């Protein structure tokens, strides 16, 4: 057995334009680091928080939920503010996508990128499976026997996972609020998404009130689009998106 080293946030100082980067459920800042590195090379400052309960034992994760994770997201926004960045765009993977939309109708936001954010029901069973997968993998890495993983997996299944329905509640609430969003928005969806109902992206695209909005479909990617094989195209598209936004204080 072995302690597992938890993941850290990152802050890539470059220029006067700022982007908050938000990761997926059970993931961490690694989900968005390559995009961070790319945007930094184009002169964009980048902060990526970690949600509470993430990158730690699965028993610790199910003591957390979106009220906690929302607090890390808001803390990330405030972090860039306090370092002096006035205009902040936001870009999120999946769950990070949902928090980016939520940020859209809560605080001043230059632009939103939502990557494969769920809005329907496939999310509910695959979030459960994802949690089991993280758990087995974390248990393995810490070097536990198969029989001890099987024991601790059965116990994990039979103990409260209320975070899974809190997630569904977040999803519904953000969705019920989509028509409050006016900020320019880029919807990004993987065609062959086995984690969410991908029509979710039509939902987001259609129901926001943003005058400026775009949707792109990615035909060769799975759910985790930032780490899949079309990511370099995604880098470009997100960059072009940010370059098309305002970023200037008007008289």
Curated annotation (Swiss-Prot):
SUPFAM superfamilies: alpha/beta-Hydrolases (SSF53474). Signal peptide: none annotated. One of its GO terms (molecular function) is carboxylesterase activity. It holds the Pfam family Hydrolase_4. Optimum temperature is 70 degrees Celsius. InterPro entries: AB_hydrolase_fold, Esterase_lipase, Hydrolase_4, MAG_DAG_Lipase. The active site is at 94 (nucleophile), 193 (charge relay system), 223 (charge relay system). It comes from the Bacteria. It is an enzyme of class 3 (hydrolase). Optimum pH is 9. Its EC number is 3.1.1.1. This is Carboxylesterase.
